Subunit: 266 residues, 3 copies
Amino acid sequence: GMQLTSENYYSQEANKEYMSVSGYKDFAGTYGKMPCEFYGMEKLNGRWEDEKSTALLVGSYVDSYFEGSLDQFKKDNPEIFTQKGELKANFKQAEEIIARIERDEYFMKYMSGQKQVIMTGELFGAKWKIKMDSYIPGVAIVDLKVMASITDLKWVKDIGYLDFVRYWGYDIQGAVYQEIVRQNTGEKLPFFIAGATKQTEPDIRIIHVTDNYLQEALHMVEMNMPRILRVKNGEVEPDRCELCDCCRHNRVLKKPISIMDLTAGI
Amino acid sequence: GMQLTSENYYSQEANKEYMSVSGYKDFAGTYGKMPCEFYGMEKLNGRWEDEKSTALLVGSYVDSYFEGSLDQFKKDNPEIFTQKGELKANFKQAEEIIARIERDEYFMKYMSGQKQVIMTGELFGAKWKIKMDSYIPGVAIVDLKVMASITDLKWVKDIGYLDFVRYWGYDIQGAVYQEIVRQNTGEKLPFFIAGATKQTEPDIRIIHVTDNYLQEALHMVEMNMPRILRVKNGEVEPDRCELCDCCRHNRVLKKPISIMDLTAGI
Amino acid sequence: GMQLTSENYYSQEANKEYMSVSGYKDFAGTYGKMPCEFYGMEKLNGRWEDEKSTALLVGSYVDSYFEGSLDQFKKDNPEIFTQKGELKANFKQAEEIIARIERDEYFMKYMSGQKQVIMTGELFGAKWKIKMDSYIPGVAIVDLKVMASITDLKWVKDIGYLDFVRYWGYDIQGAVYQEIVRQNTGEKLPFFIAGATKQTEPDIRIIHVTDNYLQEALHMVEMNMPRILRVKNGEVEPDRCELCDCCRHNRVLKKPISIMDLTAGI
Ligand SMILES: [Zn+2]
Ligand SMILES: [Zn+2]
Ligand SMILES: [Zn+2]
């Protein structure tokens, strides 16, 4: 069993040995992003690395501020600065958001736990790994998210308006995080998202994702994992969504499509 | 009774003594912008000033051109120029729009009235103030608006597609302007919006907002003013929409929300 | 009968003597663009030339690469370069797209025909002209299109979701191209769009637009041409959509509109 560390948590070998919330979503998707098994297998092999995104980089900048690892973050990610030397605007806003969080005592209490805590477990067939933004032992699991909007609802076909937690599958993250802590600690802890937005005056909220929602999502994880396990173990060929950048990079045409192909399925 | 002037019309003390069309909307809102009583009270106190907007600044640039006060506008608003010295593109387009207006005789006739005329009155409980772009005594009240689109319709829930006049509450502006002139002049004058757009060839129109629409909106003003008057006089605590920048700047968290809070109301 | 050439195909006199797929759409429109007869007549007269668009210029850059006329394209279109000398980003992406196409053998086979082939014919009242990106004699007519998306469907009122081919009237282009080749060759050839997208990994597809769709569109052309012919021959005054830049440039106001005018037709 591989001993995971801060340096190696995201490693290729860390990801082969341990399913992760992020791993699962590659295969299973969320309301906001189609599943794609191929994409998930190409990431594992190391034959596809994503172009790093402004949104993710903002969010890691802020994680790094709270962990006290900002100097090294900046060193490892020179693309956050202009050629002239100054932080690009999205990051000057990141500091605006941090200051906004810091002047709220209540919000700062949820951020007061152990920082980037790695834990391990067994679920539905595989070993898993988690890494929690702010963990307060015996009281709460907190995840910081920096997003465009907390209050915006999004339309889902045949379901209707959905809040951001269920839409982006943060119900999945909470469920797994909770359960893995439970296998290490015995304690079943509540899950809170500490949200801040990139609006011009940031919106701040602590959002409790209740155990009824965590339970329904841990169930869905259970239903999908067997198919996932089959694909990761070379036991079946992964499907391609044919709608992601990985799919498009790897396509090799052999036949014409027609209009039927564009309108298939309504 | 305070004697209003061009220099002091928008002053803090001018706004405490006089309700205005803009004042009313802060409290009462339009189809395009939620009401927020708090925002309205923080603007009055002087504890919240809005970040000046490109759209508003374009529009004031054009007002200032027609009043012959452009030199001083430019002096008071240095942020309309690049650091290198040139007018930012939105303002180089503003001059494009002005030239487009100027080559239309018909449009120029509606713009030929007295410029930025201040009048005063009494309505539904308070003193009010108005300031009209182009006033032709005994014939018409004209308001210049520079917008994205004249012809675009916008969907309103349980109402359907709405034209820009009703959607942005310019029916309110017209109604009040008309009535206050009527209390000074005796004459009930028609209200026209002289619209130009920021499309790449600007769309130009003179739009008559008829007295049936003005009447229905002056009615709505009447229904809402008592609640407004209560709030401005410290007789009740103002509600917060919790969806504007003022609300967000001023929020002090004390409790967690949940998904119920995000989906409340459909 | 005017002998058309590469140099003169798009000339004012080439367009008076020959209807073209592009000519037809000016008058008849597509699901994606309102018809406007006036616009069509002002383009013919030479009293309206369109501001050249980034999208069209990208697409011509790529045509020019395959024809071996890129040096001269660049000379004739200096606005594709920054003042500092480098290709603007949209064109650095155009080369990315070209390289992506070139590494696909199947796609390159459809691109292997004669390049920018001009043909002429008679249909429904007028002489017509066509110019085909890649023509393989006795096998296929191929048109290269560089677009935002191949898979995106667009909503059309009282019709519903429509694929890009029918939405933008490429069914019209295919139908006419096919028929004119048939009047020169005797051979009825299949029509393929060789599509590539501007997504960050370009989507590539060969799309066969089948003869049932070409037939329904050649029919619509037939129904609309008499009205078109009347307008081009000065036999009736062209209507103005009043929603395009040409219409707006040419408007001369004489009367006020009202809200009825904005909401006419639902
Ligand atoms: Zn995929
Ligand atoms: Zn508010
Ligand atoms: Zn038009």
